[PDB]
Amino acid sequence: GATAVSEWTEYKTADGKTYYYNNRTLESTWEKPQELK
Amino acid sequence: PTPPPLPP
Numbered sequence A: 001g002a003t004a005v006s007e008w009t010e011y012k013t014a015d016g017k018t019y020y021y022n023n024r025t026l027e028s029t030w031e032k033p034q035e036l037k
Numbered sequence B: 001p002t003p004p005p006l007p008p
Helices: none
Strands: A008-012 A018-022
Touching: none
Parallel strands: none
Antiparallel strands: A008 A018
16 A cells, blocks of 8 residues: 655754654654655 | 644
């Protein structure tokens, strides 16, 4: 089966980090999601 | 569009 590409937003934090925030299930991803292609 | 707060 294929692995989908969900809602992967990039947010620039005051910590100076690029986090990802799964707008999928309203999940977060600090580093690159598994579904991140 | 407002940002979500970051997780710890």
